[PDB]
Amino acid sequence: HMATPHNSAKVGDFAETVLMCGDPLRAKLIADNYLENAKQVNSVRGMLGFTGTYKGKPLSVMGHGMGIPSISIYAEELYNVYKVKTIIRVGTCGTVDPNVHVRDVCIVTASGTDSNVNRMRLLGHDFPATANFEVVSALVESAKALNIPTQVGKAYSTDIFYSKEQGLNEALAQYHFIAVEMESAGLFPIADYYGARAGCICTVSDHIITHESATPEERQTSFQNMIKIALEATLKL
Amino acid sequence: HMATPHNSAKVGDFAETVLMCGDPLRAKLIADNYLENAKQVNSVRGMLGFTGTYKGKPLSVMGHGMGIPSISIYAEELYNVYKVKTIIRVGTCGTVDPNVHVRDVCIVTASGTDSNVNRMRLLGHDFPATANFEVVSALVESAKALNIPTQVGKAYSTDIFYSKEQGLNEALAQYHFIAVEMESAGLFPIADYYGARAGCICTVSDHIITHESATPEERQTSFQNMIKIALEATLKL
Amino acid sequence: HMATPHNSAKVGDFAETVLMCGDPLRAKLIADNYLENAKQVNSVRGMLGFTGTYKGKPLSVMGHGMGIPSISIYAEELYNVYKVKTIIRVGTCGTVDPNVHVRDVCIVTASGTDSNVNRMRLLGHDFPATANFEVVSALVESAKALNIPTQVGKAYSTDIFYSKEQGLNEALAQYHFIAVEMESAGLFPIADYYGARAGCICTVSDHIITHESATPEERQTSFQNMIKIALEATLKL
Amino acid sequence: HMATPHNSAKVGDFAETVLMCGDPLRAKLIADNYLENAKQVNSVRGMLGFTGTYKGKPLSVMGHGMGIPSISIYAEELYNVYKVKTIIRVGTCGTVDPNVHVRDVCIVTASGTDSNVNRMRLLGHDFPATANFEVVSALVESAKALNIPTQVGKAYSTDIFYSKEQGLNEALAQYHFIAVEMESAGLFPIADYYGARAGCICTVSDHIITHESATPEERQTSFQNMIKIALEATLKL
Amino acid sequence: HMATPHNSAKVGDFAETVLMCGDPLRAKLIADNYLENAKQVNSVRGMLGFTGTYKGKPLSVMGHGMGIPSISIYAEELYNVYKVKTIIRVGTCGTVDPNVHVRDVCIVTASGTDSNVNRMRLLGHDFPATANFEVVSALVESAKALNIPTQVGKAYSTDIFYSKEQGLNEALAQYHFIAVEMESAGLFPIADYYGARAGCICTVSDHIITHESATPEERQTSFQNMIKIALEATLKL
Amino acid sequence: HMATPHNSAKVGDFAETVLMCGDPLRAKLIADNYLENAKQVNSVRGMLGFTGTYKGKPLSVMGHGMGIPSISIYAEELYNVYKVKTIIRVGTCGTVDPNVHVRDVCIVTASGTDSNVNRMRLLGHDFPATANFEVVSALVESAKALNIPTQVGKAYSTDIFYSKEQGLNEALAQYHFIAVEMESAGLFPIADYYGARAGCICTVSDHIITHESATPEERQTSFQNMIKIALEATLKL
Secondary structure, three states: OOOEOOEOOOOOOOOOEEEEEOOHHHHHHHHHHHOEEEEEEEOHHHOOEEEEEEOOEEEEEEEOOOOHHHHHHHHHHHHHOOOOOEEEEEEEEEEOOOOOOOOOEEEEEEEEEOOOOOOOOOOOOEOOEEOOHHHHHHHHHHHHHOOOOEEEEEEEEOOOOOOOOOOHHHHHHHOOOOEEEOOHHHHHHHHHHOOOEEEEEEEEEEEOOOOOEOOHHHHHHHHHHHHHHHHHHHHOO | OOOEOOEOOOOOOOOOEEEEEOOHHHHHHHHHHHOEEEEEEEOHHHOOEEEEEEOOEEEEEEEOOOOHHHHHHHHHHHHHOOOOOEEEEEEEEEEOOOOOOOOOEEEEEEEEEOOOOOOOOOOOOEOOEEOOHHHHHHHHHHHHHOOOOEEEEEEEEOOOOOOOOOOHHHHHHHOOOOEEEOOHHHHHHHHHHOOOEEEEEEEEEEEOOOOOEOOHHHHHHHHHHHHHHHHHHHOOO | OOOEOOEOOOOOOOOOEEEEEOOHHHHHHHHHHHOEEEEEEEOHHHOOEEEEEEOOEEEEEEEOOOOHHHHHHHHHHHHHOOOOOEEEEEEEEEEOOOOOOOOOEEEEEEEEEOOOOOOOOOOOOEOOEEOOHHHHHHHHHHHHHOOOOEEEEEEEEOOOOOOOOOOHHHHHHHOOOOEEEOOHHHHHHHHHHOOOEEEEEEEEEEEOOOOEEOOHHHHHHHHHHHHHHHHHHHHOO | OOOEOOEOOOOOOOOOEEEEEOOHHHHHHHHHHHOEEEEEEEOHHHOOEEEEEEOOEEEEEEEOOOOHHHHHHHHHHHHHOOOOOEEEEEEEEEEOOOOOOOOOEEEEEEEEEOOOOOHHHOOOOEOOEEOOHHHHHHHHHHHHHOOOOEEEEEEEEOOOOOOOOOOHHHHHHHOOOOEEEOOHHHHHHHHHHOOOEEEEEEEEEEEOOOOOEOOHHHHHHHHHHHHHHHHHHHOOO | OOOEOOEOOOOOOOOOEEEEEOOHHHHHHHHHHHOEEEEEEEOHHHOOEEEEEEOOEEEEEEEOOOOHHHHHHHHHHHHHOOOOOEEEEEEEEEEOOOOOOOOOEEEEEEEEEOOOOOHHHOOOOEOOEEOOHHHHHHHHHHHHHOOOOEEEEEEEEOOOOOOOOOOHHHHHHHOOOOEEEOOHHHHHHHHHHOOOEEEEEEEEEEEOOOOOEOOHHHHHHHHHHHHHHHHHHHHOO | OOOEOOEOOOOOOOOOEEEEEOOHHHHHHHHHHHOEEEEEEEOHHHOOEEEEEEOOEEEEEEEOOOOHHHHHHHHHHHHHOOOOOEEEEEEEEEEOOOOOOOOOEEEEEEEEEOOOOOHHHOOOOEOOEEOOHHHHHHHHHHHHHOOOOEEEEEEEEOOOOOOOOOOHHHHHHHOOOOEEEOOHHHHHHHHHHOOOEEEEEEEEEEEOOOOOEOOHHHHHHHHHHHHHHHHHHHHOO
């Protein structure tokens, strides 16, 4: 008798704060390297999740898979069944904005999308997928204390990684979207539904237009930077 | 000599920071009561605008009329022709959230809408009308310094004041929309287009569901609180 | 205790026929220059309205502001609270039709739009914003009696004055839209809702494509013609 | 080698004015009873068309079938290949409006629809399918001369005769749509495209809501009245 | 009193299997040349329908007119009032697929559309208009036994014969749509609603892209082949 | 240098026929229990994939994760980079159809969806996500050979596992959708784009309306029946 169809953890096995990334093997890397006394609490569908502490405060980390439907399943369950209060997505993104650089960590204030899931929640109208202000502020303040450069602004969550859509990148750049990814627009409205909190921070792994990609060391530095920001933010939340 | 079809002001007559409200007569009240050395710089269409200083820093205040098309005209012109860098909308709103109370100040992080103007900017997709983070932060910090409680969260900008739409308020409440008004979803994407900043702060003048309305006395107090917050925030911007 | 949130007029203070234009100062010019014994009946938000007589018939004139949400507020109130029976919008427009010229007055039979307000009235379907036939006929017949040439046909009401939409003008021209403005599509469905009458007459102030503008002299001549047409039509309604 | 895929008539075989009804056997009845020197000029797909004179004026009559796609084929061809200048649809309709009574003649000023064909012509926006004003006026004046009462107003053209859509009739009634049928919203924009004229006149054969239906005698009398109005109107066009 | 508004047939007059084509004169040709003892059961609006036998099994054939609204009327009535169990549409189509050739028989597994009728059945979502598998298989096996090559795949049902839509033919070709016609996407969901069966078989009369058209003789050969396939399939259904 | 961002396999590591299920641990179970000489060819993101032979025929099996965006990534890569020709999804589903029962095997002919990805492929129109007929037929014939009853018909692929949508189940049931799942509508159009083949077979693990759920014992039996049907079908393709 599993608590959810997608998660073998028992109620209480997840901390009130959860970091989530798309790759479950990355969740394990975070738990093994940054958490104290981490225990694996889920492996259903290989979607590894862990719970331990960071500087004495309980903290969990878990994979969410790729795309809005996948993160919607895991986040709904975490808020509803596991009584999680705060989820921070930590991920990678592409960028179309020339002012955004690979060494920039992107702190997401809101996310647009080409999915229908939010129109369906608000009678077909425009529903902004909006990060919680305390979470954003904790991330901004942590990056400043750590002397890590950031960009703060809008993400765009797409259902199609292999985009064929002409004019999209130009419009995203015109309105200064800083990150293109695939999940955050699904996370924020679920947090709203449960009266809980969510945010998102992403590292830039490539310039979508120029097709220039970040080097392995740039990815290492930005990943460490992002994860240090997120972990410190958890102490304020 | 009309610099724009809707504004007789000369280039340079507006400060880089502008407070805007719907009622041009309220803009005049703000200029007369809170600005030093305010001079009227526009009266086309009766949409009064003024420029003076607040605690020594140049500041303008101007009416924007009712609805997304009206504020879009004035804000597009201010950013493009008058080289304004920051617009803060100051207004009243209704609330559907039982946790928001009349006489509460609402600071807007993002705004939904039933307008089509943002779909038309982003190839028909979901484009969240999102406030600039430094503007939100300045408003939140000023309200804290003044010991004024705030709600920080989503607004909903409607085209239709006299709504006939069943189920809408219930959906807005379920996802913890804090403010219902008519303009901010039109302002924020224009600020994006010009690489500039915008935000919005509103006082709650009625609970849409319960139909409880703020007394004239409550409205006066909440307007005074809100305007002091916005004015103090301009010093940080 | 104001009769509406946007209008200090008492019931009865408005005549059954009202001319409306976007600019309240132009409403004042019409009242002062063409109405006999005009009285100001509203100044809330600077949205001036007046009531007098024209050739013995009571007649009012009032501004409606810019855009569909603004005219919707004022027209809903006039039909509902003030029991107005006929509103004729008088305005200016742009043209894309090479057959329409600046010396032409445009009498609007129906208006398209990029707004969502009419889809929301009819379960998402196409709802044509349609002028009342008796009002259209009165305007056409008055222009003939005054020997003023007119174009009679479709308008297009846009939410965005500063349009960036490619291909729009070409389609409008292909289907012989005679006028581009910003309000009439919101007015006609509200008249329908209250079982009342509405129409629209506009002067051509510029060719959108060439960016050709009417001279100030041409504007004054066409305004005098349009107002002469509208005032005479009120005698037939 | 047929002039079109759907019409064996030669160019010139159609008069510049055409009456069209849905039933080709009704077109034959009109030709046999009201036209002089009539000859059949089409029988492709049983869609009978005829050309003769009415009181000295050349006139054709032809069936158009059921639904927007069907009338769109025939009307496009008549305007483009056969150089027709005016089409008047003559038909029956259902009504939801309590002020409209069975055996009332309905003269259509514009038509709504649940079809996509007009969004596709105007970049997804609202395109009002609008009758030509001279055609409308000619119909109104003809009925006036024959002392036949008329309703003048909006129709609604649906793709689905067998509606299952809850709330539609109530919305149509709220906004005083006078006629529900299946074709006119497809006709008027095609006329626009070719710089030509179109109109529609319908008799009420039933009350959709109450299911009160017109008797056979009411049907014959209302058809006789309608067709005389349409024929007399052609003399002014 | 007619059993339906569009059909004078009495209950029982239609066999449980009906072939339908757009042209009622083609339905008469099929009845005269391939059915034994055919009886005309409808001629309302010239939409001829017939009932006889094919190799001892009862079979009907009837016209459906042009477009989704027209077939929807006739098919709903046949399934609902006349208790028909299986309808097979027999027709012609255009092709965009370079692998499909004039005189190729296309058996339709599903059909896309630019109509709104199926979104209106499934809360605005994507509802695939899908042929019944036993009907598809019966057609496939009959063509094999007759040694007639077939293409099996998707059709696209358009509301607009005279297309002006740029990019449509390329997208249809990109996704291997094999047939462009105007009715099947309206037929299949009505069959679903009544728990009944439907299919479609079409012959390619022209390449829409290359504009190659089938010769008059090739059309007769391909019609004979298609009709032979359909009649044989009824023996298995 | 990985052949794709999501797959470490080299080109040639995948067989031309691939079975895909959502759970990567189920793919491993399939490979270990039914494939001879299975080799792991991918483990990126824990999304295990394997290649071996089934009764001498090369066959791969791999997880696709949850939701249309996830399967779209993996399927696009398999067809485009790895030159796969046939993908069969094997899964579980819920049903709303009163004729479908838990432990029923469902073979999917076409899939509806609430996702936007297929509208974006076909100019906003209705694009039916349609299984390849040869694949459907092979699955149907295999189930017949094994004496396993099957239901053949429409699926519905949703983005939202935790549905809150009123009326959806009733409409799905009215039009006899037999299976509700989350991926197949994304798979079929990608196969089309690449000129390749796709299908789907699912076992019913619960009735959404009656809330009957299959026992763990019934689930294993239905999984075993389904997988044997799919494996045998690959020998015919």
